[PDB]
Design a protein around this nucleic acid. Structure first.
Length: 79
DNA sequence: TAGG
């Protein structure tokens, strides 16, 4: 476990909080906020990564994270 | 709710 798939949210959830919510989680690896522009679907959610695997470990526990304003089903993502 |  290292990344995480946060479901639906804000068209462009401020990666800055996502950096905190998860940064505070530990060492975030990298963040990403989808958007119905490549396939035209609902997507538009979030994906966070942790250099490590612990914040992630917990994350799935809190799958439904509350990033500042946006909150979503954070199922250990995958690409 | 699965980017990209």
């Amino acid at each position: 476990v290292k990344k995480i798939f946060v479901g639906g949210l804000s068209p462009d959830t401020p990666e800055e909080k996502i950096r905190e919510y998860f940064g505070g989680f530990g060492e975030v690896e990298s963040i990403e906020l989808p958007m119905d522009n490549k396939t035209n679907k609902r997507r538009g959610f979030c994906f966070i990564t942790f250099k490590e695997e612990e914040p992630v470990k917990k994350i799935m526990e809190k799958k439904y994270h509350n990033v500042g304003l946006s909150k979503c089903e954070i199922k250990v993502a995958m690409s």
